[PDB]
Design a protein around this ligand. Structure first.
Ligand SMILES: O=P(O)(O)OC[C@H]1O[C@H](OP(=O)(O)OP(=O)(O)O)[C@H](O)[C@@H]1O
Ligand SMILES: O=P(O)(O)OC[C@H]1O[C@H](OP(=O)(O)OP(=O)(O)O)[C@H](O)[C@@H]1O
Lengths: 466, 466
């Protein structure tokens, strides 16, 4: 069972002895500090609130467990047993904390407050930053959701330019990241963050998380199709790639099927096997059930172009109203190797220059989508901005001399729409002047209860492209 | 409840209809493919076997749950209900799988078999590659352990050169990665992997994982010390940094204490506050209770060197037996900002050139230690190498034309010691010839049971530096 007393950075166990005496309030905030990612999707907090923070999170046994561990960990009894016991006795183990957050799915420019944390009981001044560690981990679903949306922007731009519409955009970037992430829990979190923007996923874990923590009107938030891997092709033996190909497309004749084609020779597979030997099984396919040829090696741009070049000469290629080449509806290509935001841009641009419609191509991304991201990409940061000491509120901040970018905000914070319809974070409690509209930060957690939640449908709506 | 039927890549649900008819055996292996990072620490499989793979992992409820999810996920009844029911009825939900692996903590050159997977029942040919996704996630603890060890190699080289010994090496790289990782589960896995090489950690989750899945003779595998953060300094107010400093060091006067000193001006804090105003509280401290000054901004190397020069002028610096400058034992520095394998090397080399002993410095790493790593850093891959179809064993492999590095191994595999005492992976069942010694892989999993285990003490011993 999870223990919140053991879910913090070790040194935070010693911080209750470090704050100024007579401190009754610690007030902190999360932002993606200003530095290619000018706006961020806020997503993932509701998961953390429900799974880890809500209800009775302190028990008699959990306090003793923590006390025993930290005694050995520090070689000293520094642990605040008395502080945690107070929470157990007075609030039945419910956290006297208030969390206010911008609605999930909201797209917010960098350098704005996204959520705030404060203690609601003066005895628990130390608790605000105790939970920094668990809350800051929201950086990940935020960053995955943001990076995924930015890739959608690129896909949208090129799809619209090369085809004149956005049909099937929500299926142009497929999550292949399950094996390439660091854990089962990460897989589910990351997969769900991608599903804010897209509907194609192989990371099943993401579906259960959305169902449990967010909810959607549809039975499932994400979908997939039958697909081959190298084991299902190579198990037939090198001399029998054609038989493997034939068997798989015949098995999945009435649904879309993706078939990895680079086991031995991708260019041979497209020209000779797909383009000649088994052509008759491809041209007879439905528009609802295309063959999706999947290269999986070589230079991503060069390989996609060569594959399209080969297929264009073996199958009846048309030219759409924008003047771009289009494969027949029963045949498509998915690039699922070496795909990240940079190579995605590189491929669609190379395709456009060679006059190929983005209709022809879909993308798959694993590590690039769910793993090759850090807390530093969006400068995700949690800092104390306000304390009450001796009954007086003081605006607090860091401002390192050698890095002005690390300067933090002062005082009590609020988020507002500007008259031109942008966003502004007001500092030093200036939001109380009512010069702007309503504070966009809403109480989502208070004293052990989740007070406002959003469905996954609402989140998708909020995170739409312009 | 974790459901193994929902813990695979979506397309693997469709693979039982893709293998050649009358396939009785699927045999696959894991390696870190060849072409820094020339050898890998094998760590983390035991965790996966115990948490996810062992015992009764199939129930009737879990089969129905998966059936209903995949029905909506594929918009089709492609899920292998009968295959999974067979396992439940015949084996009481235990996986008919055998896994052979190198001992954990073992240091193996790239391009060698690390573990193999095969089905023990002909009916369950499809199960071998079903569990690929779960098992491939071992890339992460392997990569953390390996990258951590490579950093220890760098630290050892410079500590030995500047001081003449390796005292306290195991405390020179501290885990700060809790908030910087993608999930709670990743935090535990990654922290445990770092603890294979070092003993300092702030990521508490790592302790419980080790004690549950590996075990150590000591009460805890990892330790920490009291330390300040920006909130516990800045809360005092801009004009009261000295008061913050004084309070914290006097509260923790008998243990080591780390104090972040860059809230407003790092060079002012070192020269005027530590070096003048509070010098009397530093020079009185025990050798077992040093002040550890923590810069946290600016250029990592330039800041460390400037901090050291400042302290050198305010404090009684000595010269060690190797001719390098050494701060008094009550005074140390920790650089915990922007630390990864590359910048660690830069700092210790830069220190050496300015004649500063590595005794003076410790490092902390967060994202660089536990997050900024991917599956392709060590080329971690899981591939089928051998199948039995129509009673005949067939050597299986991929060899893509445009990437010869992606070529996989053929047939039944075994790991051996060479006459010169190195490692060799023999292919095509050639290990049966016994021209080398016995196969060095052990059966670690068979038919739902963990059959071989290693304590965390064994692993640490296996993974030590030469
Ligand atoms: O973007 P990524 O994180 O790489 O994930 C996508 C890739 O992962 C799989 O490769 P596989 O597991 O066979 O690894 P390998 O290609 O390195 O052998 C799959 O064949 C995709 O090409
Ligand atoms: O190696 P990393 O992943 O950066 O983690 C380590 C850093 O994290 C903490 O800063 P904080 O959480 O305040 O982040 P910030 O300095 O970017 O605000 C700490 O002060 C370290 O500098």
């Amino acid at each position: 069972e999870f223990n919140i007393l053991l879910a913090t950075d070790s040194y935070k166990v010693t911080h209750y002895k470090q704050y100024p005496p007579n401190t009754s309030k610690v007030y902190s905030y999360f932002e993606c500090r200003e530095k290619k990612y000018e706006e961020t999707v806020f997503y993932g907090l509701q998961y953390i609130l429900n799974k880890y923070l809500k209800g009775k999170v302190v028990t008699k046994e959990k306090i003793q467990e923590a006390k025993d561990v930290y005694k050995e960990h520090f070689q000293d009894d520094v642990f605040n047993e008395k502080g945690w016991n107070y929470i157990l006795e007075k609030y039945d183990g419910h956290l006297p904390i208030e969390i206010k957050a911008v609605p999930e799915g909201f797209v917010i420019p960098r350098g704005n407050v996204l959520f705030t944390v404060e203690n609601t009981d003066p005895e628990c001044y130390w608790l605000t930053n105790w939970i920094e560690t668990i809350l800051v981990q929201s950086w990940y679903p935020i960053t995955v959701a943001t990076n995924s949306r930015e890739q959608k922007k690129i896909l949208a731009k090129y799809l619209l330019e090369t085809s004149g519409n956005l049909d099937g955009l929500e299926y142009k970037l497929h999550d292949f990241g399950y094996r390439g992430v660091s854990s089962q829990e990460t897989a589910g979190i990351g997969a769900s963050a991608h599903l804010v923007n897209f509907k194609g996923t192989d990371t099943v874990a993401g579906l259960a998380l959305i169902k449990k923590y967010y909810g959607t009107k549809d039975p499932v938030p994400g979908y997939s199709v039958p697909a081959a891997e190298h084991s299902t092709i190579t198990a037939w033996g090198k001399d029998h790639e054609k038989d493997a190909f034939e068997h798989i497309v015949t098995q999945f004749s009435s649904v879309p099927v993706s078939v990895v084609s680079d086991s031995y020779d991708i260019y041979n597979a497209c020209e000779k096997i797909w383009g000649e030997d088994l052509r008759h099984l491809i041209v007879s396919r439905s528009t609802q059930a295309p063959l999706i040829i999947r290269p999986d090696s070589g230079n991503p741009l060069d390989t996609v172009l060569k594959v399209l070049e080969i297929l264009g000469k073996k199958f009846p290629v048309t030219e759409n109203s924008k003047g771009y080449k289009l494969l027949p509806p029963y045949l498509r290509v998915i690039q699922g190797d070496g795909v990240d935001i940079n190579t995605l841009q590189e491929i669609v641009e190379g395709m456009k220059q060679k006059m190929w419609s983005i209709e022809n191509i879909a993308f798959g991304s694993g590590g690039g989508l769910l793993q090759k991201l850090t807390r530093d990409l969006l400068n995700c940061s949690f800092k104390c901005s306000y304390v009450v000491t001796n009954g007086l509120g003081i605006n607090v901040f860091k401002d390192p001399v050698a890095d002005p970018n690390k300067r933090s905000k002062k005082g009590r914070l609020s988020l507002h729409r500007t008259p031109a319809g942008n966003f502004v974070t007001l500092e030093e409690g200036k939001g109380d002047l009512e010069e702007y509209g309503q504070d966009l930060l809403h109480t989502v957690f208070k004293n052990g209860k989740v007070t406002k939640s959003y469905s996954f449908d609402e989140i998708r709506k909020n995170a739409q492209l312009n």
